[PDB]
Amino acid sequence: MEAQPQVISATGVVKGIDLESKKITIHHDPIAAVNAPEMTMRFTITPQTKMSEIKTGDKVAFNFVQQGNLSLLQDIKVSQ
Ligand SMILES: [Cu+2]
Numbered sequence: 785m786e787a788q789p790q791v792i793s794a795t796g797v798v799k800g801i802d803l804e805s806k807k808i809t810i811h812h813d814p815i816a817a818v819n820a821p822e823m824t825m826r827f828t829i830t831p832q833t834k835m836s837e838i839k840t841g842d843k844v845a846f847n848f849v850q851q852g853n854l855s856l857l858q859d860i861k862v863s864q
Contacts, residue, residue, distance in 0.1 A: 789817055791847050792855075795863055798842045799824065806830070808860065810844065827855045836861035 796812035806829040814821055827848055829835065838844060838860060845863035848855045 791849055791858060792818060793845070793847045795843065795845050798838050798840050798844055800840060801838065803829075808838070808857070810846070825855060827857050827860075830856050833857040834859040838862060 792815060794810075794812045794815045796810040798808060799811050800807075800809035802808075808827045808829060809824060810827055811824040812820070812822065827846070833856070835857075836859075842862050843864070844860050846860035847858040849858060850856075
């Protein structure tokens with residue numbers, strides 16, 4: 785009936801990286817497109833994610849898709 789956000793773009797700060805469970809915990813800045821406030825959320829690294837080098841405390845720009853309870857990363861990189 786109308787447009788559905790598929791890819792959500794956001795910025796935030798990395799708070800945890802767990803490469804066993806393939807989970808990056810990010811405290812994201814408000815996200816206008818979805819009317820979200822600041823939130824800490826878990827994002828999933830899949831084999832299709834385009835990863836860049838990141839570490840806890842890095843500000844990042846990232847894009848993800850929601851799949852049920854998962855937020856699957858399309859890409860993530862350090863940002864200004
Ligand atoms: Cu959120």
